[PDB]
């Protein structure tokens, strides 16, 4: 048939599009992921770095 006729997309479309609500919820979930990934990567580096400080038997002879 004619290429100007668009097929049926109605079982996935929102009843009201409302562009300032669809963008706001998607950016909440991406922002929460970057929040938790930065706090997780920070404690990971501090676990490896603090293993080079003085051990428990060295501190006992201080």
């Amino acid at each position: 048939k004619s290429t100007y006729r668009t097929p049926n997309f109605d079982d996935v479309l929102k009843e009201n599009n409302d562009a300032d609500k669809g963008r706001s919820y998607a950016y909440f979930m991406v922002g929460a992921m970057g929040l938790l990934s930065s706090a997780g990567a920070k404690s990971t580096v501090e676990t490896f770095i603090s293993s080079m400080t003085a051990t428990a038997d060295v501190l006992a002879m201080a």
Binding site: T3, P7, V12, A26, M29
Partner: protein, 49 residues
Amino acid sequence: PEHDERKRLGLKTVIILSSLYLLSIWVKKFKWAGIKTRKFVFNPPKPRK
């Protein structure tokens, strides 16, 4: 001897890693929805070319 400290540190790690797993499923399903609902139509071309 680390037994009481290991179980307290494990509770913080499992809670953080569970939240990052559930958030990544939502973000992957949002960013793939244009590909998953794509539609194709075939019209056979005219011969003699």
